[model samples]
Target chain A: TTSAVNIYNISAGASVDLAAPVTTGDIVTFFSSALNLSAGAGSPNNTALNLLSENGAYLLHIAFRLQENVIVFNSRQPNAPWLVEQRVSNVANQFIGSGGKAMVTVFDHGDKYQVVINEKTVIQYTKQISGTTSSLSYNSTEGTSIFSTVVEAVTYTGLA
Target chain B: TTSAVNIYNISAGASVDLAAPVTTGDIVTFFSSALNLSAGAGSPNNTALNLLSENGAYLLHIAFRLQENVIVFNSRQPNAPWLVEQRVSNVANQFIGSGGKAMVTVFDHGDKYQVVINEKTVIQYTKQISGTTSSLSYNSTEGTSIFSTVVEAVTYTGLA
Candidate 1:
């Protein structure tokens, strides 16, 4: 446990608060192949791997929503609506699908962070997180959700 | 409740068999964004949504393996190794990643079965299940796995 330096074990419906902030050469890679969206009034449909700064602010929030395109978002702190973003409306040119063994890598490219899926730079992204981000956390479900969400085959990871 | 006509309810470490061989114009859509690969010697990492024929043969087995690329596979029977397939290695030109609600749709196009992720015809080209699929089944783990699998956010589906 924790022996795998680059691997982080996570729990469900909760956040695994980590100590390291994603540095320039750091990569936050996450694996999610499925999510259990419930018909119940209180199930979270989003999963997030977030980057927090030394200033106790949430710098970058890589949120994956169930409505098609996953995302790259930001907000100074929590409690308020963390800005929701993105709009890619076509799968004619997409390559998103994995069995549990695959993972998506979020690389800090300085000016912007890029998401590499299956070795392909598929999701080109941005930054509210520029030279910041000192701590990492993974949330299996959107915390602000009124109720808990279900986990199917999703996973959170660490510095890579 | 078999209430959701297009969405079949499933259970962990089990298979929910259904009646309906994806017709030429039918689509079998399943959702998955992550998988939990247990370090234990018996945790499964593979999830499958397959099509079987009235003759009791697995006509088309679409499987998602945890190791990068997912697949479009086949077999004539069970208890034996099913054929594994595919090779489009690159995220620069891929769009494979979903939260929980985003599902991958498998279309039966007479000759080949095509996969459409997030509205795009992403994973393409496959055959071997000519016109003989008569049933649909979802397996959250590789049946041949010596043990069971941990479901983090994995989901199986039905005709869409």
Candidate 2:
């Protein structure tokens, strides 16, 4: 709420660095435009939200696999290859059921990210690599997954 | 974030209607500029964040009383007087401890507002009136409470 949330999808390989690291308690909410189309399922990356660390040692990857009926979570470390962080089933189906347009909110808890769909808190995926989250990029290989994303930070204050 | 956060102080009786109503699950975050000034103590309505529902039926009032060292919470109904919802003390002193710059985040959880200050979730105030959370106004009679406020909704999507 304090910080402005960014709301557009980045092109493939378009890694955008944030002005500052995403501190604990910050929020990252996004929705895939692919859900609006059935084509997102065929994309190479397929609606993956990639959050990288400042030092480039950690990668928090959230992939929406509609056909598989799961929200696949993975992490990539500097020394190790990409690994699965967690896989929550029934998410893609429910999200699809709610309509292709659904909101996914992620809370940065420092060690793990608390994932929430709509108003329900689903799961917390622990960190595989450790560092402050600094940049975000969408892996839209086919440009089928359209992400309208936003990040909430600690410094943005508004006059109401 | 799609929308920019407004950072400034408003005059007394200053009410700012939002561009649109704050729907369920939206977020409201604010901070007082009291601008680290010395005049806030004598100021009336020192630092109040007042959220009014559509149709003028409910008011969520958040008051920061530094002199009394309490962050007082209050609510008003259409037919009832202002009532104390909760009194959270020790916050003013700690906010002072942070050099007078603290962030307050309010999440519209439909039935209640989850208020979080700094890094802690302080309290949840049950809403008295039920409707779309429409506009926000600061009751800064002395113009001491500087509210740089921002509202986040599902429609605000960023390009970066």
Candidate 3:
């Protein structure tokens, strides 16, 4: 049987599903290709969300199909206004995902923050800030209307 | 294959070995079983040491195995001289034995702490502070020898 990585909204008491024959150690990449959010929710813009890894050690990468478009808001700042931002600055590379699997990983490293994306390396940073609760967000400015998904999480250890 | 959890002292450049093998999604517990420490090493008495889940959630529980005989040292101040010390304060849990087992089926969810020995549940916890970096020490009156070991950790997401 296949297992699923269930992401629950502890406060809302709700969950979103990840369709698959998901196994214990599979790396599932999101935004495998272009996306169309018109049929789903709002304009797909200003959609802020969080991803929780069911198991530890699984690396997650983020990418934007439309590299040129800008990211308006990151829900981390629930009270802040949703505006175009970069990773470290707006959303430049803080957690960059370049559509076709521009890989990246996020995790808490004792005294510092350690991250590694597809071809990118680690950004060892001390004195990190806590993640915000909620905010407004969207995929990109490109009218293509994109979506985000977890590509894969590697199981370094064997079956639990 | 068997995967392991390693603990490294960034400052001392030294690392300790864990008795168990760590797997993704495993919830490990840490206890300060013994503390035959010296002076200036700090007291295990209500001291908080960072039990880093190097690869997972650094969830902590207080259940120090205080030795019957604790070594006391004189401090700079005459009135307050009793102090406990140890070589190192941090430890990591592993899952190498028991056919590469991760965690037991159930754990005590009480207000105190829990301690299991060789597949057997020996103790549990109820009502205590939950955070990182706890001070684990030996009992001064008992005057015993004690040591620290890898007990448990939460490995549901991310890794070292």
Candidate 4:
């Protein structure tokens, strides 16, 4: 019963959302076997993984560039612009091609949370508010980032 | 709701067993808020956390020394002694006293498994057998080690 559920794939210009009530200590993991991004004669063709609030506010957003091997983590507070918290480069190039596998894990550590990708620690960020996560979604901005992605949740049961 | 199920606690001269069948990709976490060890005018008192087969064969054993701040990871082959796979020292002193928290995460990655303690990578070991985990248990050896411990399992679910 510990098997992961496979979510739908997001092609260019496609998006999907699910209602997931997540609490502190829950872990969310996103996996992609191959992510292909194309600039398509533009400056910012991208794909995004997001954790959102009930009112459609962004709690966390992970953006992957189609042309470059870079990943950016962003946070959006109420009445504020999307703020970049951290960015990492030199990621495996296969994510930009057709057969590269990548994985990201987010740990909800109560007052703070940690993110790990491909066995590498990306960030351990503190949140301004603590509550259950409302939603999990993926989007393709400009319809150029195509990938097969799956989202999984790990519920934490302990004294945080 | 993602919460941990408290499996068992090991106190002085006490042991508990449970029928927890684990599978591949299931994560098992162990936590200790405080660990107190006493020799009672002797040496080599120990505490242990173990994952066993249905027939009570040792799959893995984690032992802590009462007189020293040392933790050891061990394994048992079909007819082998408890072989020490790795050892660590200079662990957090809070485990020796009160209010110090320590955690160990065991990730069942199928062909191989990874163990992390206090957010530090301890080992990524391959299994001699590949199948579902039969049981999880805690034991106290010689009644010399006393600690408040918890074992939690995180079930993996996809996309909510």
Candidate 5:
């Protein structure tokens, strides 16, 4: 029997560039397709988590999408090309700052994702089982599938 | 007795150019001295709702100073330069469409501001004040000021 589990996957191989000014509270959502998080038994979960056989299970995969340089905070499954759930906050000189980071808050016992920069919350998302916990495993033998960023740190709570 | 009230004011002379890509809910904010709302010393209440002020009091005024067809919304006293407040909503496509209107919503009893388009709530603000119901004259004759275009709208409320 397939066991279901969630992942708070940190992204890789992504970058943003801005041509205009940005401010606080501005949101940027991310989509799995953009970073190419498709593959691995289809949904990124096992039946043990009650997600493997669930209809519309893919909806639980993606957590956010990216714009030119902005990141959108979305919880819906990756289906459409461009559907914004919400925007993520940005830094003063991110896109051009040293070590720019995109933060998002992840929810779900196994599925939690949050972005922080300089001890400040940048983006947070809950209810993202797949995109949050999905792994970015790659190898010289196996090619990459979009989400391949190296994770800095993750905080998780076991209860719901 | 000194009287000071906060309010929002836009003028007929003040207009924005519709070109390229503009969406609903984009926010714009700034300060201006071109806006004014003046009434007689003892005018009847609501007699000059168009003017922003009655009894010669300089109520709260928010406007957008425009440069190169871009206007920024702001607030300031009468007959003087304006101070930077916040951006109004960005609903660029609203006016670009055929016979479209920029739906504006006055919030916090007309202190906050928001805009909507295509049934989307795009732009929002927590600062700035429009004219009071007791005095319905909002003056925006001050020259253009700095403003930012933020958020596009999908739905909105609070308008005639």
Candidate 6:
């Protein structure tokens, strides 16, 4: 009964959005392959994956910088700036440009959330959700940071 | 608009069933990690994944043999025995026993079906699907051939 649900196939210049009503103790998984990021400055504004609340507040943000070979994970609070929980550097060049696959999972840890990359826990932080429904999006902004294949989102029901 | 709807999770020593109403041009994906296979002889009866028709007919079958390090894919037709479409051998030892992640995709090609593993096209064959609704199941038969993490199933609608 284990399934990897195909959420959406994102191309070089497209975006996809879906309603991801997640709560405490739930898990949300995102999968993508051949992620390409833009080179040069001001490219960090380009987002690869983002989870947002109904009021358009970001809950989680994932961005890649090809020139730096770094992946950034950020969390947002109600009245605070986006906190940089992790800035993974020295990643493989293939992952920065293309040819590498990325799998990220966000687990609700009651007061905080745990972010895992390729099955490894990378970041944990507390963010104000403020709403019941959140949206998951994959955006290929500024004509870079695209997923060649489908970007999948799978949610696991938390124990009640 | 495209979204991967989570169906179920199959865990070690557990199984889950779902009615997958697939049609021409649709695609189903399976993701798993650390697949364990039964050792010794008389263990071929273990099934890791199975897709069946409503009347209890096998549409697709996937099994692993630890003894031979072989993974088999079979298809079934009406009034005919299961046909072995592909017998992959000499796979990496990690995939045969444990510690490897597997991602499989099944594409409905209308007349034939295409099966891909780890982003590579592995098998393509036509099998009798007598009903509009098919069932997907993952079994940990004989306390072997189980998945360590959650197994995910995702579906994509096809164009006509």
Candidates 2 and 5, the one with greater lDDT: 2
Compared with the true structure, what per-residue lDDT tens digits does model 6 show for residues A1-160? 1212223444443434543366665556777765544434326544467767766677777766665667676767556776645676754532432235566666655566676655345556566453442666666546555454356565543222
- RMSD vs true structure, all candidates: 15.2, 12.0, 17.4, 17.8, 19.4, 14.5
lDDT (10s digit) by residue, model 6, range B1-160: 1212334456644444554466665556687765544334326634457766767666777766666567677767557776655677754542432235566667666666666665345556565453443667676546455454468675543222
Candidate 5 - chain A - TM: 0.32
Between candidates 2 and 3, name the one with more favorable TM-score: 2
- Residue-level lDDT tens digits of model 4 in B24-102: 6456666555445443312442667766666666666667664566766666855766664666675454233223445
Error of 3 at A66 (Å): 4.8
Using Cα atoms, each model's DockQ against the true complex is 0.02, 0.05, 0.03, 0.03, 0.01, 0.04
Q: Can you give the TM-score per candidate against the true fold?
A: 0.37, 0.48, 0.25, 0.44, 0.23, 0.46
Q: Place model 6 in a CAPRI quality band.
A: incorrect
Candidate with the larger lDDT of 4 and 6: 6
Per-candidate local distance difference test = 0.45, 0.57, 0.28, 0.54, 0.27, 0.56
Q: What lDDT is reached at residue A154 by model 4?
A: 30
Q: Rank the candidates by lDDT, best first.
A: 2, 6, 4, 1, 3, 5
lDDT of 3 by residue, B10-103 (tens): 1111223333333333233332223333312323432222222333223332222223222111111223332322221222221112232222
Which stretch of 10 consecutive residues in model 6 chain A shows the poorest summed lDDT? Answer: A1-10
Model 3 misplaced stretches (Cα beyond 4 Å): A1-76, A81-102, A110-113, A122-128, A131-160, B1-159
TM-score of 2: 0.48
Query: Which residue runs does candidate 4 get wrong by more than 4 Å?
Result: A1-20, A37-45, A66-69, A93-99, A128-130, A149-160, B1-160
List, residue by residue over B1-160, the lDDT tens digit for candidate 1: 0101123444445444454335553445454433333212222325565667666667676554445433435555655565555544432233334332344555565567666544445555566546655556656543432112322222111212
Query: Candidate 5's error at B149, in angstroms?
Result: 25
lDDT of residue A67 for candidate 5? 21
Q: Which one wins by lDDT: 5 or 6?
A: 6
lDDT (Cα) of model 2: 0.57
How displaced is residue B125 in candidate 3, in Å?
Answer: 27
